[PDB]
């Protein structure tokens, strides 16, 4: 479905890329997006897919647009009932982020690290003697939701229902509309926020519920909308990213062996994997008519600014599809750039590093299940549909 081409858009800039179903997704999702960086493709193009929108294809422009919040607004960040905070905001933004940093900043992640390891260990040990798993379902999906319950001081018994609600927001089975799933999340959070307003702990919800905004107490509406984002922001991104990384390690024994031999390289490897298997593609909306790098943008045009593409740009990193854990400068915008830079980036890195450290020492040798062709999916958060892995349980190390 190709939306009618707006009069202000010149035909030479038209490239009908579909962010939800790119051509040759079969070759890998990053590769599918990287078509936008072929030499015949301009730095800024218009697609008639998905309502019609601009796409910045190079890291320079992606970074610039994210820095220029006055022209490129977050009021409409998705192509093509959402009310989470502080996503859709462009003074308030700063205070909400400051409050979120209080609950997921480095000192919190540092305190949580060993608990993250103990969770990783328990999951891996549960899988280890089987000699197979679907990594995405059996390790990746249960992990970040459990980390959120730790962060937010919520009981383990609440996981199935909360997981169901967040699953309906991104992959509905039809039982709930997005609005219904969101409201049920709020029905869950509201009593807890109220309770911890009056009797706080040191968990994330307690800290949020007692925050201040513009010199007055954070409202219940503001607090639930922040807690909601802290929950959903760290689920599909981590699930899918872990899956891309493990798929790669399964298919590249030489890279796997490098991390087995030199575990001290795992933090640097994490960063290089974040670049190579970057997965988010958000956008902005034009606040006014604006000429950007020789291209006339119109007030209200949407522009896709794919975080994924900056680090894949050969102008930012040489031989960008190659994975090299020793890169001296790993340039990427995997966690975003500018005023909405991911608040969960420190927690996410710790989850990744802990996962790789524990998997590589317990199950150092694993492969893709023979005959399986790994399928990717594309959209705002690109991903791995399933990741069937196999290993010999006699090569593994028991707890």
Please tell me the distance from the alpha carbon of residue 311 to that of residue 274, in angstroms, as a whole number: 9
Nearest residue to 188 (alpha-carbon basis) of 148, 158, 229, 230: 158
Interaction of residue 104 with ligand HEM, rule CB under 6 A: yes
The residue count of the chain comes to 399
Interaction of residue 56 with ligand HEM, rule CB under 6 A: no
Site string for ligand HEM, 338-377 (x = CB under 6 A): --x-xxx--xx-----------------------------
Interaction of residue 234 with ligand HEM, rule CB under 6 A: yes
> For ligand HEM, which residue of 123, 181, 230, 273 counts as binding (CB under 6 A)?
230
> For ligand HEM, which residue of 282, 301, 313, 358 counts as binding (CB under 6 A)?
282
Residues contacting ligand HEM: total by CB under 6 A: 26
Q: Torsion angle of alpha carbons 160, 162, 167, 173, nearest 10°?
A: 70
- The one catalytic residue in 28, 52, 211, 344 is 344
Q: Which range in 56-64, 206-214, 231-239, 390-398 contacts ligand HEM by CB under 6 A?
A: 231-239
> For ligand HEM, which residue of 47, 334, 378, 396 counts as binding (CB under 6 A)?
334
To the question of whether residue 49 is assigned a binding role by annotation, the answer is no
- The one catalytic residue in 70, 171, 262, 315 is 171
Q: What are the tokens at 299? A: 């007030």
Long-range contacts of 63-66 (CB under 8 A, 24+ apart): 63/310, 63/333, 63/337, 63/338, 65/284, 65/292, 65/303, 65/305, 66/284, 66/305, 66/333, 66/336, 66/337, 66/338, 66/339, 66/340
- With b for 16 or more beta-carbon neighbours within 10 A and e for fewer, the 22-40 pattern comes to beebeebbbebbbebbeee
Interaction of residue 63 with ligand HEM, rule CB under 6 A: no
Residue ranges for the known binding site for heme are 342
Active site residues: 171, 236-237, 342-344
Q: Which residues bind ligand HEM (CB under 6 A)?
A: 77, 86-87, 97, 100, 104, 229-230, 233-234, 237-238, 241, 279-280, 282, 307, 334-336, 340, 342-344, 347-348
């Amino acid at each position: 479905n190709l939306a009618p081409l707006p009069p202000h858009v010149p035909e030479h800039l038209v490239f009908d890329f579909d962010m939800y179903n790119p051509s040759n997704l079969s070759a890998g999702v990053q590769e599918a997006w990287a078509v936008l960086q072929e030499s015949n493709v301009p730095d800024l193009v218009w697609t008639r897919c998905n309502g019609g929108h601009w796409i910045a294809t190079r890291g320079q422009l992606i970074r610039e647009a994210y820095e220029d919040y006055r022209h490129f607004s977050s009021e409409c960040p998705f192509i093509p009932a959402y009310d989470f905070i502080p996503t859709s905001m462009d003074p308030e933004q700063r205070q909400f982020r400051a409050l979120a940093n209080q609950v997921v900043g480095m000192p919190v992640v540092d305190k949580l690290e060993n608990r993250i390891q103990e969770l990783a260990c328990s999951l891996i040990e549960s899988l280890r003697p089987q000699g197979q798993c679907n990594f995405t379902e059996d390790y990746a999906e249960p992990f970040p939701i459990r980390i959120f319950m730790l962060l937010a001081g919520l009981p383990e018994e609440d996981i199935p229902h909360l997981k169901y609600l967040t699953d309906q927001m991104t992959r509905p089975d039809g039982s709930m509309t997005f609005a219904e799933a969101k409201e049920a999340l709020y029905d869950y959070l509201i009593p807890i926020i109220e309770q911890r307003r009056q009797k706080p702990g040191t968990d994330a919800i307690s800290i949020v519920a007692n925050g201040q905004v513009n010199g007055r107490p954070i409202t219940s509406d503001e607090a639930k909308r922040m807690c909601g984002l802290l929950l959903v922001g760290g689920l599909d991104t981590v699930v899918n990213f872990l899956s891309f990384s493990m798929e790669f390690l399964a298919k590249s024994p030489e890279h796997r062996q490098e991390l087995i031999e030199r575990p001290e390289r795992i933090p640097a490897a994490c960063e290089e994997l974040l670049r190579r298997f970057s997965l988010v593609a958000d956008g902005r909306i034009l606040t006014s008519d604006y000429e950007f790098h020789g291209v006339q943008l119109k007030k209200g045009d949407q522009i896709l600014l794919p975080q994924m593409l900056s680090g894949l740009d050969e102008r930012e990193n040489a031989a960008p599809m190659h994975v090299d854990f020793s890169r001296q400068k790993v340039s990427h915008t995997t966690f975003g750039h500018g005023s909405h830079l991911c608040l969960g980036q420190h927690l996410a890195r710790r989850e990744i590093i802990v996962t790789l450290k524990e998997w590589l020492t317990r199950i150092p040798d694993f492969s893709i299940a023979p005959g399986a062709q790994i399928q990717h999916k594309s959209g705002i958060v690109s991903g791995v549909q399933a990741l069937p892995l196999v290993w010999d349980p006699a090569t593994t190390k028991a707890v």
